[PDB]
Amino acid sequence: TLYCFCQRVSFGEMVACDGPNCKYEWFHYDCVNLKEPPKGTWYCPECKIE
Ligand SMILES: [Zn+2]
Ligand SMILES: [Zn+2]
């Protein structure tokens, strides 16, 4: 998926977000500094400041 602040495809790393207002739902783990697959509803830094 082509969604991120740096705008790049999620090649092998795709973490999905839960945000009612969120076009950037898809991300890659390395951008958002993660290696753990989320155990539940993952709010991206954008949703966390909304
Ligand atoms: Zn990125
Ligand atoms: Zn979000």
UniProtKB/Swiss-Prot annotation:
Q: List where in the cell it is found.
A: Nucleus
What positions does the entry give for Zn(2+) 2 binding? C17, C22, C44, C47
Q: Which residues bind Zn(2+) 1?
A: C4, C6, H28, C31
The job of this chain, per UniProt, is described as:
Component of the NuA4 histone acetyltransferase complex which is involved in transcriptional activation of selected genes principally by acetylation of nucleosomal histone H4 and H2A. The NuA4 complex is also involved in DNA repair. Involved in cell cycle progression and meiosis.
Comment field on protein domains: The PHD-type zinc finger mediates the binding to H3K4me3.
Describe, as the record does, how this protein assembles with itself and its partners.
Answer: Interacts with H3K4me3 and to a lesser extent with H3K4me2. Component of the NuA4 histone acetyltransferase complex composed of at least ACT1, ARP4, YAF9, VID21, SWC4, EAF3, EAF5, EAF6, EAF7, EPL1, ESA1, TRA1 and YNG2.
- The name this protein carries in UniProt is Chromatin modification-related protein YNG2
